[PDB]
Swiss-Prot record, chain A:
The keyword Acetylation applies. Component of the small ribosomal subunit. Mature ribosomes consist of a small (40S) and a large (60S) subunit. The 40S subunit contains about 33 different proteins and 1 molecule of RNA (18S). The 60S subunit contains about 49 different proteins and 3 molecules of RNA (28S, 5.8S and 5S). Identified in a IGF2BP1-dependent mRNP granule complex containing untranslated mRNAs. Binds with high affinity to IPO4. Interacts with DDIT3. Part of the small subunit (SSU) processome, composed of more than 70 proteins and the RNA chaperone small nucleolar RNA (snoRNA) U3. It comes from the Eukaryota. The modification ADP-ribosyltyrosine is found at residue 135. GO terms for biological process: cell differentiation; cytoplasmic translation; negative regulation of apoptotic process; ribosomal small subunit biogenesis; translation; translational initiation. The modification N6-acetyllysine is found at residues 14, 36. GO terms for molecular function: mRNA 5'-UTR binding; RNA binding; structural constituent of ribosome. The gene is RPS3A. This is Small ribosomal subunit protein eS1.
Curated annotation (Swiss-Prot), chain B:
The gene is RPS26. The keyword Ribosomal protein applies. It is linked to Diamond-Blackfan anemia 10: A form of Diamond-Blackfan anemia, a congenital non-regenerative hypoplastic anemia that usually presents early in infancy. Diamond-Blackfan anemia is characterized by a moderate to severe macrocytic anemia, erythroblastopenia, and an increased risk of malignancy. 30 to 40% of Diamond-Blackfan anemia patients present with short stature and congenital anomalies, the most frequent being craniofacial (Pierre-Robin syndrome and cleft palate), thumb and urogenital anomalies. Component of the 40S small ribosomal subunit. PANTHER family: 40S RIBOSOMAL PROTEIN S26, SMALL RIBOSOMAL SUBUNIT PROTEIN ES26-RELATED. The modification Phosphoserine is found at residue 53. GO terms for biological process: cytoplasmic translation; negative regulation of RNA splicing; translation. It is found in: Cytoplasm, Cytosol; Cytoplasm; Rough endoplasmic reticulum. This is Small ribosomal subunit protein eS26. GO terms for cellular component: cytoplasm; cytoplasmic side of rough endoplasmic reticulum membrane; cytosol; cytosolic small ribosomal subunit; extracellular exosome; membrane; nucleoplasm; ribosome.
From Swiss-Prot, chain D:
GO terms for biological process: cytoplasmic translation; maturation of SSU-rRNA; ribosomal small subunit assembly; ribosomal small subunit biogenesis; ribosome biogenesis; rRNA processing; translation. The keyword tRNA processing does not apply. The keyword Cell membrane does not apply. It is found in: Cytoplasm, Cytosol; Cytoplasm; Rough endoplasmic reticulum; Nucleus, Nucleolus. Its main location: cytoplasm. The lineage of its organism: Eukaryota, Metazoa, Chordata, Craniata, Vertebrata. It is linked to Diamond-Blackfan anemia 15, with mandibulofacial dysostosis: A form of Diamond-Blackfan anemia, a congenital non-regenerative hypoplastic anemia that usually presents early in infancy. Diamond-Blackfan anemia is characterized by a moderate to severe macrocytic anemia, erythroblastopenia, and an increased risk of malignancy. 30 to 40% of Diamond-Blackfan anemia patients present with short stature and congenital anomalies, the most frequent being craniofacial (Pierre-Robin syndrome and cleft palate), thumb and urogenital anomalies. This is Small ribosomal subunit protein eS28. SUPFAM superfamilies: Nucleic acid-binding proteins. InterPro entries: NA-bd_OB-fold, Ribosomal_eS28, Ribosomal_eS28_CS. It comes from Homo sapiens (Human). Belongs to the eukaryotic ribosomal protein eS28 family. CDD domains: S1_S28E (cd04457). Component of the 40S small ribosomal subunit. Part of the small subunit (SSU) processome, composed of more than 70 proteins and the RNA chaperone small nucleolar RNA (snoRNA) U3.
UniProtKB/Swiss-Prot annotation, chain E:
It comes from the Eukaryota. Component of the small ribosomal subunit. Part of the small subunit (SSU) processome, composed of more than 70 proteins and the RNA chaperone small nucleolar RNA (snoRNA) U3. It is found in: Cytoplasm; Nucleus, Nucleolus. There is a cross-link at residues 45, 47, 90 (Glycyl lysine isopeptide (Lys-Gly) (interchain with G-Cter in SUMO2)). InterPro entries: Ribosomal_uS11, Ribosomal_uS11_CS, Ribosomal_uS11_sf. Gene3D superfamilies: Ribosomal protein S11 (3.30.420.80). One of its GO terms (biological process) is maturation of SSU-rRNA. This is Small ribosomal subunit protein uS11. The modification Phosphoserine is found at residue 123.
RNA sequence: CGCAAGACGGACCAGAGCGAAAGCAUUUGCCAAGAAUGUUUUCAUUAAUCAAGAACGAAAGUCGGAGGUUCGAAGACGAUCAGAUACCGUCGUAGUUCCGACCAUAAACGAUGCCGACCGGCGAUGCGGCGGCGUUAUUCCCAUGACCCGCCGGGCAGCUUCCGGGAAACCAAAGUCUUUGGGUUCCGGGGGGAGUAUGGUUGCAAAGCUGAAACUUAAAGGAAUUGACGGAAGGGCACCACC
RNA sequence: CCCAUGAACGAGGAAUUCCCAGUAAGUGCGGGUCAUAAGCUUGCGUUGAUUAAGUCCCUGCCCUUUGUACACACCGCCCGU
């Protein structure tokens, strides 16, 4: 009857200034017709893009959720919306003869963003270990989890979203936790496993403009 | 007559073990008794590895793997030939197959 | 006959018997 | 669909309910020689030359 | 009509391959996932219940999907392969590999490959009884 | 992209831990408890087993009140079958979840009472303690945490057994038994009838506990050995097989 | 044996039997039986061979392990008003 792609415009998706790569791809929407407008149709769609496609010298197992906030000049302007690890990476770090320690905090930044950071760490076998299994005791696991939560809170609640994502890009918080927990039980693969945004402040166009450079 | 000293399961010093579901039939089988296979397989089969590699946008992509933990009841594990019946003497051998 | 089913049949017999006896 | 000359290295065997296909392994001579396996039909003698009109047909084994 | 910008570069879509043991889905969509380009299943390529999940039906579906995406301007694809998941099986069906190979073989460029089958932290009861399905 | 509901707590998760057993796995906090270890602390036989009594006791089930995702007895259909109203599939009610009150039964199993002595070896593992080269982590003066090599105590297990014992299977206990006595509780006496009838007793009910006999029978049964058979696996073979 | 009097006149219900090179099949001939009695059998040549150098799917067999309440040995044994 009517070809629906003949009435569709293509749009450019832009990453925030925290990433070396700016244009992360293209996206579609039906043209503004009657009640429905194109800009509203592109205002909540989330792009999960591998970090290696965002930064040219980074790891590919880290994915960032970028959500478009507003569209001007047929460019879609995105913001940090979440971070995750690839399923294969997480499944690869879960081995059978070690303890996995997980922690999570709900911590707000200085610009009103409320985040839920998930940290995962694994017990490391020493280079001369003859014992098959390396297990942390329950109090050791509790201390490691407390250190994880404390470090995440210290690393999030004092900076705004920009510096939080800048720390996430090389996972500074995970390396800090791995360093801090070395004297309780040597940890193996410490990562901020997942970041999900619980609530955001009211939209500010100028803040988003300063965000995209 | 007692066929196995461990009664075909790996439960010592505890009363109850939580059940799981066989991946084939969905039978309720205790976790200690169930036969567990950890399959780490490439998402791209070896026949298709070269064709996917050439069509890759990124050079040196190293394709991801699949991590699936398989739980089996005794009936389905025997039928699938994951385990076989053994002699009265070879039954005691707990060493995994050298492969 | 399976012993469980023999017990079930006996229990149904007893249920009917206690139904008829008041 | 290039034409490549490859030599049979080993004959595996037959397959099917009654047996209707033959398995050999052929190695290239002028394509950065590597070992590729492929099923085959008919008299393909001991270490003959099997011609690959294509480098992607494999043998699904068992 | 389509993106005719920077002909020398790739236009990336996302192919959601749903390979259950009943049939296989070849679903190419926008980068965000909200807009869909084309979805061709193995069931609209074979007129029989059994071959719905066959590798050949998946190859046909992937060929049609790639043809439509090429005629719609998309040049490269990110792969998000999933099995049924949930409390049911986590192994992709027979058509996943053939669909992916048909996408690669028909002039499409493959990006990142990711497995996204729904995995419960723990689930509800499976459809079988406590004695399983006995056929 | 969100939103809401209940259910569950994967991977980590182990012949690993805890609990009297049933049973127990997301974080954190509170509350009370507990074993082992350490002790040149205290009391000084206060102990072991236990009729009567008592606490707890999977699942299913019952009566109220919430909740009711998923699965799902019953039921309704759809299905190759000679015949399902079975196995399979789509739905689906009580239930499955929680809060009270009942119920007191499981292949509730290690089919092995508890307490105490003695009797081989070895490698691990969990907890506590002790000793010791060295390797790693918090400013360069130390403990301590993670490893490493050991010793002691309790624990879950991995063991020949021609110590020894058993009918053997097998068991370091199922040993220390005609060379028969450490203490003590429960409990069996060929197979059926039968855990039935009856009486009592508990329960709302379902049912639970205690529990015969007449009669009937030469075996029933346990372990193992050979064969035969298997719609059991592995490896071969045959145009009286197939392709 | 001849008059040429014209018979679905050119790969076959369900079920299947035999067969791998001088197999099969066609074709005649000789022995036995006998009175030179053959449509039978036992041999012999002659023409001459499509397909397959495999498998354990059907029917079975064998060299193992395993289960058994079978040993008259699965055509077994056995449960139910």
């Amino acid at each position: 009857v009517v070809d629906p792609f003949s009435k569709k415009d293509w749009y450019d998706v832009k990453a925030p200034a925290m990433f070396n790569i700016r244009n992360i791809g293209k996206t579609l929407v039906t043209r503004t017709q009657g009640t429905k407008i194109a800009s509203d149709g592109l205002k909540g769609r989330v792009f999960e893009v591998s970090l290696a496609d965002l930064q040219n010298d980074e790891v590919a197992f880290r994915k960032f959720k970028l959500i478009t906030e507003d569209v001007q000049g047929k460019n879609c302007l995105t913001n940090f919306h979440g971070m995750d690890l690839t399923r294969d990476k997480m499944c690869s770090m879960v081995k059978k003869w070690q303890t996995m320690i997980e922690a999570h905090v709900d911590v707000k930044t200085t610009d009103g963003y409320l985040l839920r950071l998930f940290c995962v760490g694994f017990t490391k076998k020493r280079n001369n270990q003859i014992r098959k299994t390396s297990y942390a005791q329950h109090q050791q696991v509790r201390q490691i989890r407390k250190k994880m939560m404390e470090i995440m809170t210290r690393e999030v609640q004092t900076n705004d979203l920009k510096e939080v994502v800048n720390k996430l890009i090389p996972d500074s918080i995970g390396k800090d936790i791995e360093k801090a927990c070395q004297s309780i039980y040597p940890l193996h693969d410490v990562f901020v496993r997942k970041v999900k945004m619980l609530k955001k402040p009211k939209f500010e166009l100028g803040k988003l403009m300063e965000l995209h450079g | 007559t007692k066929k196995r000293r461990n009664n075909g399961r790996a439960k010592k010093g505890r009363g109850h073990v939580q059940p799981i579901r066989c991946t084939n039939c969905a039978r309720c089988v205790p976790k200690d008794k169930a036969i567990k296979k950890f399959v780490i397989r490439n998402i791209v089969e070896a026949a298709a590895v070269r064709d996917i590699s050439e069509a890759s946008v990124f050079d040196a992509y190293v394709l991801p793997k699949l991590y699936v933990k398989l739980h089996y009841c005794v009936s389905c594990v025997i039928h699938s030939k994951v385990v076989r019946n053994r002699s009265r003497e070879a039954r005691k051998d707990r060493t995994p197959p050298p492969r | 006959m399976r012993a469980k089913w023999r017990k079930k049949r006996m229990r149904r017999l007893k249920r009917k018997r206690r139904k008829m006896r008041q | 669909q290039p034409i490549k000359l490859a030599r049979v290295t080993k004959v595996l065997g037959r397959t099917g309910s009654q047996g209707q296909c033959t398995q050999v392994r052929v190695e290239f001579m002028d394509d950065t020689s590597r070992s590729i396996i492929r099923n085959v039909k008919g008299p393909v003698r001991e270490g003959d030359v099997l011609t690959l009109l294509e480098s992607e047909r494999e043998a699904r084994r068992l | 009509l389509g993106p005719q910008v920077a002909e020398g570069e790739n236009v990336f879509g996302v192919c959601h391959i749903f390979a259950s043991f009943n049939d296989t889905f070849v679903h190419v969509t926008d980068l965000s996932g909200k807009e869909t380009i084309c979805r061709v299943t193995g069931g609209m390529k074979v007129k029989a219940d059994r071959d719905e999940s066959s590798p050949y039906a998946a190859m046909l579906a992937a060929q049609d999907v790639a043809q439509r995406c090429k005629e719609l301007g998309i040049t490269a694809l990110h792969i998000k392969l999933r099995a049924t998941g949930g409390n049911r099986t986590k192994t992709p069906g027979p058509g996943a590999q053939s669909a992916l190979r048909a996408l690669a073989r028909s002039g499409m460029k493959i990006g990142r490959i990711e497995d996204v089958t729904p995995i419960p932290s723990d689930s509800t009861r499976r459809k079988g009884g406590r004695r399983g399905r006995r056929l």
